[PDB]
From a paper:
The first three show about 30% homology to chemokine receptors (e.g., CXCR3, CX3CR1, CCR10 and CXCR1), whereas UL78 displays negligible homology to any endogenous receptors. While previous studies suggest that US27, UL33 and UL78 regulate viral replication or reactivation, there is no existing evidence demonstrating their interactions with chemokines; thus, they are classified as orphan receptors. In this study, we report the cryo-EM structure of UL78 and unveil a novel form of GPCR oligomerization unseen before — a homotrimeric architecture, thereby broadening our knowledge about GPCR structures.
When the receptor was expressed solely, only the trimeric form rather than monomer was detected in non-denaturing gel. After sample preparation, cryo-EM data collection and single-particle analysis, a 3D consensus density map was reconstructed with a global resolution of 3.12 Å, enabling model building for all seven transmembrane helices (TMs), three intracellular loops (ICLs) and extracellular loops (ECLs) 1 and 2. Specifically, the inward movements (10.0 Å and 13.1 Å) of ICL2 and the intracellular end of TM7 fulfill the receptor intracellular crevice, thereby hindering the insertion of the C-terminus of Gαi. This intracellular closure is achieved by various interactions, including D133TM3−R134TM3−E148ICL2 salt bridges, D143ICL2−R301H8 salt bridge, R69ICL1−W145ICL2−H146ICL2−H147ICL2−R142ICL2 stackings, F127TM3−F239TM6−Y240TM6−F294TM7−F298TM7 stackings and I138TM3−V229TM6 hydrophobic contacts. Looking at the extracellular side, the top of orthosteric ligand-binding pocket was significantly covered by the inward-folded ECL2, while the latter forms many polar contacts with the surrounding TMs.
Author numbering:
A (entry chain B), B (entry chain A), C (entry chain R): 34 to 261, 269 to 318
Write the structure that this text describes.
Amino acid sequence: SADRAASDLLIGMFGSVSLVNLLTIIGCLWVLRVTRPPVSVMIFTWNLVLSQFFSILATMLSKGIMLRGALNLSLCRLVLFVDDVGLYSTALFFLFLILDRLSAISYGRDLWHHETRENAGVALYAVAFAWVLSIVAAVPTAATGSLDYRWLGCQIPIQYAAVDLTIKMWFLLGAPMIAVLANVVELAYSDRRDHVWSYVGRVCTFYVTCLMLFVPYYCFRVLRGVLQGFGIMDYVELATRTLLTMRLGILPLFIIAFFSREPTKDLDDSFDYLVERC
Amino acid sequence: SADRAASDLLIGMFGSVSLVNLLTIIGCLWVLRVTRPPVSVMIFTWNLVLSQFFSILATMLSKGIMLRGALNLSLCRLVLFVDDVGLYSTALFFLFLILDRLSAISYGRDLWHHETRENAGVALYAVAFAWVLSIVAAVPTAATGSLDYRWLGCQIPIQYAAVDLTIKMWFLLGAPMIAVLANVVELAYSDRRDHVWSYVGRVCTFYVTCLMLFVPYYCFRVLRGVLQGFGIMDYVELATRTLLTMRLGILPLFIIAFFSREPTKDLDDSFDYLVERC
Amino acid sequence: SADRAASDLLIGMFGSVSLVNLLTIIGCLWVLRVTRPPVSVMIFTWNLVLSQFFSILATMLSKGIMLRGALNLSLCRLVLFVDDVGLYSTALFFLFLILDRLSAISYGRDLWHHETRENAGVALYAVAFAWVLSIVAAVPTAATGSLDYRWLGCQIPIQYAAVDLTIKMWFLLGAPMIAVLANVVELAYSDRRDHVWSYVGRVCTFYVTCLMLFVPYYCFRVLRGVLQGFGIMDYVELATRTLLTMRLGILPLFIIAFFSREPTKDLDDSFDYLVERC
């Protein structure tokens, strides 16, 4: 049982680091308001922060950091539901933020004085849809969650792993990145192309990061149904599970990366003026 | 069994009301031909009318309004197949009609004399695929239908509720609502933006209406697998199922809402001219 | 067992014919390099050729042309995994090739001297994702493959037919053609429309061919779960399977069809110049 305590400490350390990172993003977003951002960006970025907080909070309860002993089936289903709600919302919020910025930057209207009320209305309507769709997509998982017996956490049973991977694959990489690739391909041959490749390079490394964090875990879960103390098959499950947990500290860093055309330059101006007078 | 008889009356009244509404749309579409619309609109709208008629006809048989006693497994599977064919076709026809009109209105070419043969050819091929995909997508639900024993209808069992919701979610609001949002987001920053917000307001309330009608019934069916005369869990199933039945009287009203840029103004000219001389 | 041997000969003959066709496509692509194509086309077409080779090789092992007797569960799962990897990659590669060429031809920049380094970078990054997604999407198949008993080949059990059709429907005609139809619908109403209808007429017949080759086999497999020596239900399964195997000789013919705007004219110039001097 010594390995279980070590795994509990490692997950808790990652989450505490991730929680500090999220608070830094919240503070960074707060000081970025001086460089007037469009309401569309503000709606998407703030909803991303809320979704990340839900995923971080539910992940620790899923790993049983402090709820060991009281983790029944009712709590296991509720925790797994909240985790996927943040998991699904982040994919949709990032997809809409990328699409909003790709269209805005390409047409040359990405500043505060370049957006209308209708632009803000679409962002609010898109955010409301993404929240509701995430709840609906996470309903099947709330009716199939079960306790973990190798470890002391919460995880969907292996018999539903194939269905779980299919929903996750479409929601995280199937739909969001086919739509992004279709838009980029059309954007690559258009006249509104010169000032979009800096942003396109950011969305390429973002989906690669998402690809290398989500694929190893769910693919292994499906494969464990035929591959059959702890053994080698149990430590690799933990090894591929922490990679999923590291998304709580890497994804929040991409909120600023998609904030504007050159966030690293606007942030310096905002911070320099913040420390000078206000 | 008194409540069951009242259930048939409520569904039967809704179907008769919906049938009257559909006939009004058929008549309204007929009198709208004087304001000669593009062939692309005519192909989509008339195929929608055929799709709605299939859904209305199959829903009455699904509830067992007149087929009680003879509702075996073979008929229940066949009826559930036809009902989902109309359910899937309507989502695809509405998605293609919205996309066709959004592009046509934005570019300023939405009248009869602004379309070519190739525009009509795309609409014909898009309709042909949407009919075939609906048949294919409704094949799995034609091999898993079963008799309902709480009520005297015909519904998919609860063990396939998770799979049923996943297919329905993608078809009704998964693919069509992402594709529409992706186009609208691009349209919000383009020069072809001034005369598209009247139509965008119509597609926003349409998908909200679809969200309010479809989500509660299928989400409850999945949740009923874990929540476990009639009881409270049986009346809420009927309450959340009638909302699905009201789609037969609400969706046909959106056929004219997407007919053109300002259907409420073109309809008045068509009706006023028709009653005068022809 | 006489009919079983005949089926082995028919499938083997189709593969040998398909193998010759693929080698002709490889040779045809090699002689098409004189008419300098963009690197984006070269990346997509060559990756398509590799995917067809995987599908051709795995299909023959799946049918047990020469591996009868040693076809265990481990070999059956591996072969079925490879076949879907080629099957899924072809759908994604064809979708990206169509989208790349539709955008390039519409904007008037489809020649070698009209593409930039960023154009080739997107094609390389899109190909890398399509390979990874195909591997991930084929992972569930490797966990559910089983040995065939009515015949001596490899095929998914009928209990997973519903899940198999859902994944295949989305990958082959669900996502790729919704995105294609959405782009074409917008293209039909734009100014960049005059010189795209020759290509659009080519993607309409291609997807119809995919519709009539993939649908019958998977739709029948789901229906066989309720419809219940060899009988009529076993010969139709063979008849509906050779249509799937026939895709190995039809799909490679579409690699050159999507090569450029008018491949039948560029090929003649390339072949005539090759036989003259070099």
